[PDB]
Each structure stands twice: as structure tokens, then as C-alpha cells.
Write a protein that binds this ligand. Sequence first.
Ligand code: HEM
Ligand code: HEM
Ligand code: A1CN2
Ligand code: A1CN2
Ligand code: H4B
Ligand code: H4B
Ligand code: ZN
Lengths: 415, 415
Amino acid sequence: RFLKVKNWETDVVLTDTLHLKSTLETGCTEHICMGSIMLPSQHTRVATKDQLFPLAKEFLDQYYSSIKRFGSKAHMDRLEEVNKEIESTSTYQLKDTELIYGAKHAWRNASRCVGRIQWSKLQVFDARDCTTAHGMFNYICNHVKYATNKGNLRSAITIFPQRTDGKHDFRVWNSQLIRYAGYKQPDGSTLGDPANVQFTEICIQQGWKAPRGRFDVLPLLLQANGNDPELFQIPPELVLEVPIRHPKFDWFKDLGLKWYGLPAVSNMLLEIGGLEFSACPFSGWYMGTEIGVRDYCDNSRYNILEEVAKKMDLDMRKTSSLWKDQALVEINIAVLYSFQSDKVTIVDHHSATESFIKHMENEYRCRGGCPADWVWIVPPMSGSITPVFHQEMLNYRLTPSFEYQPDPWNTHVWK
Amino acid sequence: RFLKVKNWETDVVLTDTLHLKSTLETGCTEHICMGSIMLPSQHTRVATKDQLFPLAKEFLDQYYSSIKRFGSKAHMDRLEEVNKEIESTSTYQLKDTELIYGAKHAWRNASRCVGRIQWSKLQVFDARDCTTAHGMFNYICNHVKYATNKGNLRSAITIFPQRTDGKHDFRVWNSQLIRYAGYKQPDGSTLGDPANVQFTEICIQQGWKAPRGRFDVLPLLLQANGNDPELFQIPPELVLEVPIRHPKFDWFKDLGLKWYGLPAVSNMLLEIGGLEFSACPFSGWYMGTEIGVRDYCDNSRYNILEEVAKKMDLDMRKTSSLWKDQALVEINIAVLYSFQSDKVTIVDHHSATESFIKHMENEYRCRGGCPADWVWIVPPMSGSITPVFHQEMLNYRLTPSFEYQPDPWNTHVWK
Ligand code: HEM
Ligand code: HEM
Ligand SMILES: Cc1cc(N)nc(COc2cc(CCN(C)C)cc(F)c2F)c1
Ligand SMILES: Cc1cc(N)nc(COc2cc(CCN(C)C)cc(F)c2F)c1
Ligand SMILES: C[C@H](O)[C@H](O)[C@H]1CNc2nc(N)[nH]c(=O)c2N1
Ligand SMILES: C[C@H](O)[C@H](O)[C@H]1CNc2nc(N)[nH]c(=O)c2N1
Ligand SMILES: [Zn+2]
């Protein structure tokens, strides 16, 4: 009841008691582990008034434990107050301070997030007064501007009104506020980002005039209070982009690559005290490998290890020449170099993973544990030369949390 | 009750029913996943006559199902026969054919093993007639010779007598039949393999005269039927070694690296029909990354990314120059190149991981599933440019199996 995780590179041993507070299930049973299923049925998201008070009570008891005033009158009053409001309205509302705590701790509890050392320094924009897609677009634009901070990126989340009935639902339909378009070709090949082609067509469906290149920033599709979503173009001056050059290969400019500075995940669901915020875009800054490895080099993403290795003049005949590995390291040197030379906040997968081990030490000391998904924490290149490879991580689901949710067009009852 | 695993790079979907046959537990519960604990208490190994027949019956019912003659008289007789022998002797003995099946399927069931596409082509040397450390040493030498096959490596396992009481126990004390010695220094640094220093001293304890270099092949320490283990030097002509050169950097010879051709894991436990074979060395051929990444570049292993990157003339000031990544790809190009140019069987982590996906297809088709540990199947470099990164794997514990077991010197009641 007091589990142990070891680092096999440092012989460090931490003791995890925090998992005792754990609430939701994982997908693993005693006789099967599913630690590598991408979107388990547990990580995906309609609740009633009955279940809503335990979740409200549980969340509130830890929020007052957080600000050192647990069990007091201001606590016991706030429990009655929300109890009373959940009888009266079969839902309730979070105090501005309860939102900021809740959100911060959904990030803190994200076991698949390697950059959580910064969880406390999160900026919460309370957009619960929003009512229109235009209001969303305005809130989202001020997010983009603030979090971008001219390359000196800042963590932020903008929280649109919580789900109520379920049919009046705020959603960003984008998977990220900034993503490049994806267009299929005559021969069935793909220009742009193959991940988004389904979304790119949904935008053209609703009227997007596509410039039909690679790195075309998509418009925002914003569903407000259940109504049909509406296209909005982020002002280009607000979308900061790093053109990718290499600090050796001058032909790497002619590759003509670039990425947006701001990773800002928009399509997920924030759970606080049993309340569901269906739109809650959040942003940080990139780890280099998300762009250099996954975006640029996944097979069904930009798939550039081909053209890069060509220009490197690499033994591409044999699989065992490791030409794919060689061209991958250069591509990530270029991403990190490019972002740093434009003063745009980026972190390499070595620095990010050491900070996470430093963060894990804090969380097992001043909190008793740190839920961690090794399958997701280990960078997708040079796994074992980074210190997270050798660290055992206990994965469990705490709340407040971020949950996946179905894409809106699979569920949205249209006009 | 018919779980689904998806490949997110190919959209391939397999259906796992084989996990229904699963028997032992994993360490994960509904509310915690431990898929990244190295040696869970389940994966580590005294049984009574009561429990011994279900395990005997379960194993035999699948062995006759294997050779198409399930439920027949030869089956029902063999069940009575072993039932009778487990009453009479509170243990039993495997037919030569039941050993070969059992062993092959312990390899087949090893969910952490990426090279299992070859599980059926395993050579089983039945050393259950062995009684002395000298007999062990002779059996082990014929293993080494056979599996090495002059660089054209072959899979093999040598099975010493099964555990009985528990105090008469055959054990190879080596973790592998061939490993380099590790000696600590005046300044506390380490010459050789830091992993083995504890073992290297136990050998010098029992009388090993150490040549005190790096790549000094350790002697065998062989415990036979419970008696004190005894040192034996594998004839050097039997220990094939690849000196590591690079196909560009002529200063990579002057690095002076070399590795043994034969990976041969000796310290683990083979479970067949509830029977425990405490000594069962098994060997295949290397994946390149086990040497180039883990051996050569783990921090507490040979830790050569230092000296290699120096000679590469690399930006070692900044962590974010990715100099560690750059020097790692070259080191693995050199290992693969070196082994191939000496006609010594080696596989690159790209070829090995594609074969495993091909193998996974066979196992979900002609068997209903394939237990797989993603944390261990994904190569420790260039994770996501290999197809196992994107494949969901169901991990479960089938039997016959290989289990870890405590090291003998922590348990051996000495003389
Ligand atoms: C501050 C810089 C940040 C960095 C470097 C970072 C890095 C990462 C990385 C590399 C992943 C793995 C996902 C992938 O590779 O596709 C991830 C996942 C995630 N991060 Fe962070 N992130 C940051 C900020 C944030 C913020 C501000 C939040 C929430 C407000 C957050 C919450 C999450 C969540 C929910 C996931 C996915 C967990 C899941 O899929 O279940 N992160 N992050
Ligand atoms: C034929 C070539 C083979 C290759 C390329 C191969 C490769 C690997 C690799 C890369 C690992 C991960 C361990 C690590 O990286 O430290 C592993 C684990 C393992 N392999 Fe294989 N192997 C081969 C043959 C065999 C054979 C012949 C057996 C059994 C007779 C076997 C059974 C296992 C077991 C039991 C494990 C570890 C599972 C655990 O720790 O629970 N493998 N193998
Ligand atoms: C704020 C932030 C910063 C950063 N540097 N990186 C990220 C990446 O975050 C996520 C990535 C995915 C991709 C999931 N895949 C199946 C497509 C799903 C999520 F839910 C995430 F939160 C986020
Ligand atoms: C036959 C074979 C071929 C091959 N190419 N590689 C291997 C590696 O197999 C193992 C490696 C370890 C290291 C475990 N670590 C904690 C030190 C533990 C085991 F039980 C293994 F079976 C085996
Ligand atoms: C199949 C597997 O779950 C899937 O590829 C996961 C593995 N680990 C990951 N880890 C991170 N950080 N990001 C990912 O997208 C994935 N994908
Ligand atoms: C902590 C973690 O379980 C440990 O480092 C594991 C991770 N995955 C691995 N995978 C392989 N193939 N070999 C290993 O030694 C390990 N080590
Ligand atoms: Zn699990």
C-alpha cells in the first residue's frame, strides 16, 4: 500500500503513496496490462446530479487542503454552498480560485506529460462568460498572443463554459489552435499534414478557401453553446513560425521547412469537481522531438527522412546503414537550433527529461507521488540516453484531469 | 472478452483472444499500471505436489492440442501417467518432446522479446542427465560452439535438471555465458563492464586470476545440484568476438572496442508444466542496439558517448546540440557494420522490429494473440521511426515462461 519505483541508472528509490488517492481506473486488470493502448476507454469522456457531489466534495476537500485551510468553516460553508447549488441546479460553478487550482492540477496530474515541472506556473484565462463563436475566437486570439509572448512562450489555458445538458457544448473542432492543412492529391499522395486532411476538408466544407500549400495554418472552427461551428482565421501576425535551418547544411534552408512556435491542444476535456469543460485550449512550448521526430518523420505525417537523407548523401540501400537514424538526429539538431536562434522557447528531449526526473523527485517528496506514463514520457528518439528511460513510473489516474473526447463532427447534431 | 490492438501508423487492427488463456498476474490492478517496473514481484520466482497437477494438466492439454491429437487416448494416458507420478514422487519428468515444446513456447510467450519471430526454430539441448559442474561446463561449451556456428548464429537453450527440493539446484551464476569483467579502480572509476563488478569480485573471491583489462571474458561459475559453484574458463577459441570498426571513421578502430557475438542469457528460470528449471542458458543473436546503445552508451555501462563524441569533434558544450544523439547513431552504424563484415549474425533495430510486427500478425491469426511488452519491445533509440512504436501491444503472462530469479549468492547456503 506504499509502492516503490526505482531508477536503474542512479539507484534512486522513491515511495509512491499518492496513488492511494487515485480514483478512476486505468484499463489494466490483474491479468492484462494495457499501458500501450493509445486512447483507452477510460481516458475518453454524461453525468447526473447524484454523482456530482462526491466529485464536488472530493475536489473541494483537496482545494482547501491546498491553501492550508482544510476542514475549517470556509471549507464546510463552501461544501454546503455547492451541495445546496447542486440540489437547486443539478450542477454548480467554480470560484475563480477553484478554477485556477483545478486547471493547474489537471496538468499536474497528466501522467503522459513530460513538461509538468512547470504545472504551477500556468496562466488560466476564465472564458466562462463566453457565448458566441466570435467570443471564443476573441478569447482564443488573446490566448495565442499572450502565450506566444513574442517567442518567450508562456503556459496558458482558456476555459470555456462547462458542459451542462450536453447538447449546448463549447468545442474547438481543431485538434490544436495552430496546425497546418492537409490536402490529398490526384495520385492520392498528401500535401501538408496528413494528420489533418479529414479536418482540412471539414473546413473547406464549411467554406474555407484553401491556399493549397504545405504549411497553411488552418482556420479555427468554433462551436459555441451547441450551435454550428464557424470559421475564423487567426491573424497571421499572431501565428509565430520558426523556419527550420541547420547549423551546418546550408541546403537545409532549401528543404523549406518551418513550424509554429506554439503547441496548443484544443480538442480535449477538462474535468474539475465532476464538471466537464468541453473546450479548454491549453498551450506550452515544444519539446524538440515532437516536431523533429514525430511531425517531420512519422510515416503518416510529413515523412521527410526520405528527402533529408537524400541530401545528406546517405547509404539508403541497406536498412542497416541506419540512414533513417542519421537523418533523424540532424533534423532535430536543426529544429532546436532554429527555434533557439529566433528566441522562441523550445526544450531538447535531454533537458526536458532531466527536469521531469527532478520534477518526479519533488512530487514523491512534497506530494507523495507522480503519476507517469513511461510509454509516453520516454522521448521518441534516443530513449535510453535520456534519464526517464531508466526510471520506473507508476501510472494512475488522479483528478482534476484532462480527458480525451470524441471529435465534435462524429457527435454534433447539425443544424 | 475479445480485445483489440491498433497500429496507429498502418491503421491495422488485430483481435486478441489468446489473453483469455492467460494464467499468472501482471502487477497492474484496475487502479494502477506497473508496465514500467523492471522486475515486478510476478516476474520473479517453492511449489508443492498439490498445485503441481493443474499446471501439469494445463501444459499437457495444450501440448497434445499442438500436435493435433488432443483429448485422445495418448493424451488421457499421459495425464494419468503424470498424475500417477506426481502422487508417487510429488514431481514428474517431461518427455523429450514435451521439453522441446515447453522451451520453445517459453520463448514464444516472452512478451519482452522482440526477436520471437524465430521461436519455433529453437534448438533444445536436454542436459537433464547432468550431475557435476564439469558436466555443466561441458554442456555449456557445446552450446556455445553450436549456437555460435562460426558466426552463423543459431538459437539454442540447454536445460539442466529441474529444481526438486530447492536446496539441490543447478545454477549458472553468470548473467550470460559470455560477459566482460568489471573492476573498480583506485579513484572508484570502473574498468570493463560496471554491470558485472559485483560478479567479477565473486569470481576473484573463488580464485579467478583477473587479467584486469576491459574486455576480459569472465569464467563460468557453475553451481551443480546445490554444491558450491566452480570456476571454468570457456576455451577462448569458442568465444567469438567482433572488433568494432566504423565504415568511415578510421579512428574508430583506435577506440579499440569489441563485443562477443553470442548473447546467451543464463541466470533465469524456465517454467514448464509447473516444473522449475533453475539453470537453462539460452542464446540467440544480437539486435544491434543492445550493444551500441545499452552496453556501450548506458551511463552505468561502458559510457563511451564521451570519448566517441570527442573524436567526432562535436558541440559538447550545449546539451541541445544533440551531440549524444549524433554519437549514438554512429556507434550503432559501427556495431552493425562490424558484425556483418565478419559474417556474424546481427540484426538492426529496424529489421528486428518489422519482423516482430510481421510476427505479431502471425500470432493474432494462427494463435489469437501475442503478449507484448511495449516498454521493452521498442528499441532504445529511434523509437518512433520503427513500426513497433505505433503498435498497441497487449501484455499478459502465458506459460510455459521464462521467469527472473534471485541471484544464487543471495540465497545459496554455502559449504
Ligand atoms: C510547458 C511545456 C510543455 C511541454 C514541453 C509538454 C510536453 C508534452 C509532451 C512531449 C507530451 C507527449 C504528447 C506527444 O508527444 O504527443 C505531452 C502530453 C500532454 N501534456 Fe504536456 N507539455 C507542456 C505543457 C502542457 C500544458 C500547459 C498542459 C495542460 C494545461 C499539458 C498537459 C498535457 C496533456 C494533457 C498531455 C497528454 C496526456 C494524454 O494524452 O493523456 N502540457 N506534453
Ligand atoms: C533470435 C534472436 C533474438 C533476439 C534478436 C532477441 C532480442 C531480445 C531483446 C532486444 C530483448 C530485450 C532485452 C534487453 O534489451 O535487455 C529480449 C528479451 C528477451 N528474450 Fe529475446 N532475443 C533473441 C532470442 C531469444 C531466445 C532464443 C530466447 C529464449 C530461449 C529469448 C527470450 C527472451 C527473454 C526471456 C527475454 C526477456 C524477457 C523478460 O525480461 O521478461 N530470446 N530479446
Ligand atoms: C501543451 C503541450 C505542449 C507540448 N509541447 N506538447 C503537447 C502535446 O500534447 C498532447 C498531444 C497529443 C497528441 C496525441 N496523439 C494521439 C495525436 C494529445 C494530447 F491530448 C496532448 F495534450 C502539448
Ligand atoms: C537470447 C537473447 C538474445 C538477444 N539478442 N538479447 C537477449 C537479451 O535478453 C535478456 C536481457 C535481459 C537484461 C535485463 N536487464 C535488467 C539487465 C534480461 C533477460 F532476462 C533477457 F532474456 C537475449
Ligand atoms: C501504440 C502507442 O500507444 C502509441 O504509438 C503511443 C506510444 N507512445 C507515445 N508517446 C508520446 N509521447 N506520444 C505518442 O503519440 C505516443 N504514441
Ligand atoms: C525502468 C524501465 O522499466 C527500464 O529502464 C526498462 C525499460 N525498457 C527496457 N527495454 C529493454 N528492451 N531493455 C531494458 O533493459 C529496458 N529497461
Ligand atoms: Zn498495465
